[PDB]
Amino acid sequence: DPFEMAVKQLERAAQYMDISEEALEWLKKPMRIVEVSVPIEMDDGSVKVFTGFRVQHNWARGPTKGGIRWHPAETLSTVKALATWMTWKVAVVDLPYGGGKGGIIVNPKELSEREQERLARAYIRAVYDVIGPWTDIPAPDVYTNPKIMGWMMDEYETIMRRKGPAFGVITGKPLSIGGSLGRGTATAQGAIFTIREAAKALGIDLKGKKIAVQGYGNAGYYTAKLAKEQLGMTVVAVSDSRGGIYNPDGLDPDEVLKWKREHGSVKDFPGATNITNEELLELEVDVLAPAAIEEVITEKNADNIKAKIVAEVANGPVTPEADDILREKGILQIPDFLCNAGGVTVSYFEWVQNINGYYWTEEEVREKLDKKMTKAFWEVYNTHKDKNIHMRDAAYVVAVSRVYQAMKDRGWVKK
Ligand SMILES: N[C@@H](CCC(=O)O)C(=O)O
Numbered sequence: 001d002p003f004e005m006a007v008k009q010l011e012r013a014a015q016y017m018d019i020s021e022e023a024l025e026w027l028k029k030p031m032r033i034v035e036v037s038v039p040i041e042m043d044d045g046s047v048k049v050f051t052g053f054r055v056q057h058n059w060a061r062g063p064t065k066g067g068i069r070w071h072p073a074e075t076l077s078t079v080k081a082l083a084t085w086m087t088w089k090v091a092v093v094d095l096p097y098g099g100g101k102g103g104i105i106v107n108p109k110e111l112s113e114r115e116q117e118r119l120a121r122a123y124i125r126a127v128y129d130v131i132g133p134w135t136d137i138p139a140p141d142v143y144t145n146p147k148i149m150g151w152m153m154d155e156y157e158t159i160m161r162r163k164g165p166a167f168g169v170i171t172g173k174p175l176s177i178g179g180s181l182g183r184g185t186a187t188a189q190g191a192i193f194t195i196r197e198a199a200k201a202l203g204i205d206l207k208g209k210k211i212a213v214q215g216y217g218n219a220g221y222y223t224a225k226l227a228k229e230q231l232g233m234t235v236v237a238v239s240d241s242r243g244g245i246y247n248p249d250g251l252d253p254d255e256v257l258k259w260k261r262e263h264g265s266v267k268d269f270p271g272a273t274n275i276t277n278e279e280l281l282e283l284e285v286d287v288l289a290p291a292a293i294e295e296v297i298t299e300k301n302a303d304n305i306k307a308k309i310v311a312e313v314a315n316g317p318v319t320p321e322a323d324d325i326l327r328e329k330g331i332l333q334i335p336d337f338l339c340n341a342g343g344v345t346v347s348y349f350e351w352v353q354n355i356n357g358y359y360w361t362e363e364e365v366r367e368k369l370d371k372k373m374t375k376a377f378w379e380v381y382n383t384h385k386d387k388n389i390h391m392r393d394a395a396y397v398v399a400v401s402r403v404y405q406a407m408k409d410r411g412w413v414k415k
Pocket of ligand 1: 066138343
């Protein structure tokens, strides 16, 4: 189970910090769980009822935040674990947010556009009483995009009778309706800032160094592109779920994306040697950025990693055994919920823009993301040095300490 795995992670974290038993018990349970029925009328005229969730783990630091998943395998346990994870994610990067998560047990592939809009509007009508600009801010997630976010915001504004900032009730919206710039490259930009800070900490100059990326979706492609331009690095290996390519002199991510668009995959790229993911993970490269399916670095290949920095852009792509093995080699790891925290920071920026009624630009959003990511990385690294623990442990310590301090300040826990 995912919620048990999350709870265990929290206990393991609490082992390295001084936290009261009552606070741990409080943090082991979501503060509010809402399970609703989401009825929509289909194209054939029949009415089908779906199961929707909205978990608000903790709101000591402020309104909860988290996306909505439309997955046929959604469970309450998954939503609860992801909300718990979102709490620490927003706490490590110092946002005035709590942890939240929603989901609908639905296969969105079998739904038409009209049915998808009806599902979004019905979900908003079902969970209206627990969401709001200052209560709970949903966001795009697996199988949800900005189109669904716009439909959801419109339904919320219709119910809300335009009595306040209905734009800020949800993030990831289209630019025409409370849209925020930088929302396509948020995760990659945050990962690049964290990689730059890690290289600064290790004393490595990234100008001309090597990078390898696993997974060539939005995150992987934009990570490679931003690395090559901003950090001046030599992209030598990229890979999708199909296969990988290698070229020591350097690859051009734009051309690789064009090839992927044409032939359907990065396989057989001209001037490059076709390889598989497993050997791709073991090239002698300065930094490694797994941006693909989780649990790629395990005990089987942990000792074979030759990268000086491993940036876990993906969601937990490294197992704890591989974590210990990599730390034993001196390889610096950026924790998964610290590396890809650029997505929630830009969502916070979007919420601020919506609340204020004044939107920013591309340079403004990029400048702020730099500040937030640099400060979060330095906080985690300072905890890393002071407590002499793992990088992932330090991030948990920082997040749980912030949430615990907020809880103590409100008087929720007296000790
Ligand atoms: N991190 C989740 C949701 C958080 C947010 O964007 O507000 C996502 O990938 O969308």
